Amino acid sequence: LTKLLIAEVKSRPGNSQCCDCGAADPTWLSTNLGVLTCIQCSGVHRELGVRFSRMQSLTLDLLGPSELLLALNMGNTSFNEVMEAQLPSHGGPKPSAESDMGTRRDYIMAKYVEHRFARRCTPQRLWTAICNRDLLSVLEAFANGQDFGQPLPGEELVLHLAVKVANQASLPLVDFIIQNGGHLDAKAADGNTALHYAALYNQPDCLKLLLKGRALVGTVNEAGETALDIARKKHHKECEELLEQAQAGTFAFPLHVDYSWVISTE
Amino acid sequence: DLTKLLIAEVKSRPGNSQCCDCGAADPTWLSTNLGVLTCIQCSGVHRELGVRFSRMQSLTLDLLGPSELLLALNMGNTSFNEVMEAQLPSHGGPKPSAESDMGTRRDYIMAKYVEHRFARRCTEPQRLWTAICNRDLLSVLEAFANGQDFGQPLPGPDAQAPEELVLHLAVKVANQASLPLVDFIIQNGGHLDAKAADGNTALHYAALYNQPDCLKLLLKGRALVGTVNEAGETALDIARKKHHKECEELLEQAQAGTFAFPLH
Ligand SMILES: [Zn+2]
Ligand SMILES: [Zn+2]
């Protein structure tokens, strides 16, 4: 399946040219952004750090369908439509395949850190985008330095709203917020996190994305309930099962106390 | 029973009987990435800062285990504040009290943790290199508090050439006592995925140097699994070559994790 999906990714609009320099047949995926770059641009992405871009080679690196969710629903042309909307037809400062590293660095930093080339927008817009399942409007809000930390009027936190209203088609929007929003742990007045909301609204695929994003497991809301409590009480069995495993560290890779080291150390 | 022991140990660290940020008695909220304890009001401001800055969990109310406690056991409010509040005067400074209004409390914590406005000023690659080798958690904290980019390679004593990325060095020289340094840099440095000239990531280094605890921390931190260095080797390849059995098993589990639990 991953082979079938990778082939699909590479056919997305704009995906036969590096997102940042137009080099033919990019094989480097920014998994949190859903774009493809050449080897030179990918190195620059990597050097931004994990907050901005997480680079894996389609060809060389271990990938599964989850890493491909955004890439299957973004693509270079879509992403650039928002993120290079200020750029002139002739490219301006955008590098080409043979550009020197200094130019290539300066451009990628401007494009992804400062968002220099992105469409400008300036709340109700964001609520509507989320309910519309408009991944590109969510990208635009992020490109305007938006707080996915600030409540939305339709009172609902951005990630909470995305999770509540999620269907299969809108999963990319949820994944995009989890990976790029500042505020995975935000509570909301009654103490519910996005994980509590995924339990409450029976959103097991959201739960998988939150857990993958390292959402906090086993915290309580103002009522004293965990996401697991809510799932059990609602008969949301698929959610309970995921939350039982999370609480048990089905991964998380827990460190253990080394008794020997403790004794030899006091 | 075991977590209970560690939580009592955390609460007994110097300065942990009072909130890190306002002095309120008996703080029960832990910033897990920083290893400090705050009161209820200051915890809400921390959480509002965002995951990048602080992740808050209740020692009393929320599920916790050894992994989330590692930094707490080794930091504590006094240690932390010796660095992060070094610039404050003895009296009449901006540090809130238990009774302070939320605007006051929010401005201070922002300045303290985002601006690092109050932290001991220190100019420094050699400094940080020696800290890591000396398992000096507080100097790592000091470097962080002065805007040090853990993304920039460090040059060693002299000997040369291995310039080392900060996390790489910390993993390479790690022992059981230095794990909190590794965890601090993983959670708070910008650069978990950094490579280094031969293509090795910190995960590759943890397999290379037989550091299975650093490996769990890297994986907890969501290190990329299954990527190749310039020789075409994954961390798992390297663990198998060196016969590092615990590393191989951890990485086999991680690779298998990539394909669980699939979306509908
Ligand atoms: Zn390129
Ligand atoms: Zn406080």
Distance between CA atoms of residues A92 and A84, nearest Å? 11
- The DSSP bridge pattern shows strands A35-37 and A28-30 to be antiparallel
Structural Rg of chain A based on CA atoms: 20
- Distance (Å) from the alpha carbon of A54 to chain B's nearest alpha carbon: 7
For residue A253, the chain B residues in CB contact (below 8 A) are 67, 215-217, 219-220, 250, 253-254
Q: What six digits make up the tokens of A211?
A: 């857990």
Element (H, E) at B217: helix B212-220
Distance between CA atoms of residues A169 and B254, nearest Å? 28
Ligand 1 centroid from CA B223, angstroms? 24
Pseudo-torsion of CA A37, A178, B190, B198, nearest 10°?
Answer: -40
* A24: three-class secondary structure by DSSP: strand
Identity of residue B235: A
Q: How far is CA A80 from the centre of its chain?
A: 17
For residue A261, the chain B residues in CB contact (below 8 A) are 176
Distance between CA atoms of residues A21 and A91, nearest Å? 10
Q: Does A59 touch chain B (CB under 8 A)?
A: no
For residue A149, the chain B residues in CB contact (below 8 A) are 48, 50
Q: Does B58 touch chain A (CB under 8 A)?
A: yes
Pseudo-torsion of CA B75, B80, B83, B87, nearest 10°?
Answer: -170
Distance between CA atoms of residues B26 and B17, nearest Å? 5
Ligand with the closest atom to the CA of B98: 2
Angstrom distances, CA of residue B54 to CA of A57, A220, B199: 31, 18, 31
Interface touch B258/A149, C-beta < 8 Å: no
Q: Does B92 touch chain A (CB under 8 A)?
A: no
- Distance (Å) from the alpha carbon of A220 to chain B's nearest alpha carbon: 6
Name the experimental technique. X-ray
Cα–Cα–Cα angle for A166, A168, A169, rounded to 5 degrees: 90
- Whether residue B173 contacts residue B132, with contact meaning beta carbons closer than 8 Å, is answered with yes
Q: Does B147 touch chain A (CB under 8 A)?
A: no
Which residues, at least 6 apart from B179, have a Cβ–Cβ distance to it below 8 Å? A255, B70, B213, B214, B217
Classify residue A57 by its DSSP letter: E
Ligand 1 centroid from CA A22, angstroms? 6
Q: What six digits make up the tokens of B20?
A: 């890190």
- The DSSP bridge pattern shows strands A55-57 and B36-38 to be unpaired
- Distance (Å) from the alpha carbon of B97 to chain A's nearest alpha carbon: 24
- Residue from B192, B193, B211 to probe the interface with A (highest A Cβ count within 10 Å): B193
Nearest alpha-carbon partner for B79 in B141, B143, B29: B141
Which residues, at least 6 apart from B104, have a Cβ–Cβ distance to it below 8 Å? B96
* Number of CB pairs, chain A paired with chain B, less than 8 A apart: 130
Distance between CA atoms of residues B255 and A86, nearest Å? 41
| Sheet containing A35-37, strands listed edge to edge, beginning at the edge strand earlier in sequence | A35-37, A28-30, A55-57
Distance between CA atoms of residues A165 and A70, nearest Å? 18
Q: How far apart are the first and last CA of chain A?
A: 53
- Residue from B9, B34, B51, B179 to probe the interface with A (highest A Cβ count within 10 Å): B51
Which residues, at least 6 apart from A47, have a Cβ–Cβ distance to it below 8 Å? A105, B151, B194
What domains are there in chain A, each with its CATH number? Answer: 1-121 (1.10.220.150), 122-254 (1.25.40.20)
> What is the sign, positive or negative, of the torsion defined by CA atoms of A54, B260, B199, A39?
negative
Identity of residue B168: H
Element (H, E) at A29: strand A28-30
- Whether residue A28 contacts residue A37, with contact meaning beta carbons closer than 8 Å, is answered with yes
Classify residue A74 by its DSSP letter: -
- Distance (Å) from the alpha carbon of A148 to chain B's nearest alpha carbon: 10
Instruction: Cite the DSSP H helix spans in A49-193.
Output: 65-73, 76-83, 101-112, 124-132, 135-143, 158-164, 171-180
Distance between CA atoms of residues B139 and B181, nearest Å? 10
Residues 170-199 in B contacting A (C-alpha not used; CB under 8 Å): 176-177, 179, 190-195
Interface touch A251/B2, C-beta < 8 Å: no
Classify residue B121 by its DSSP letter: P
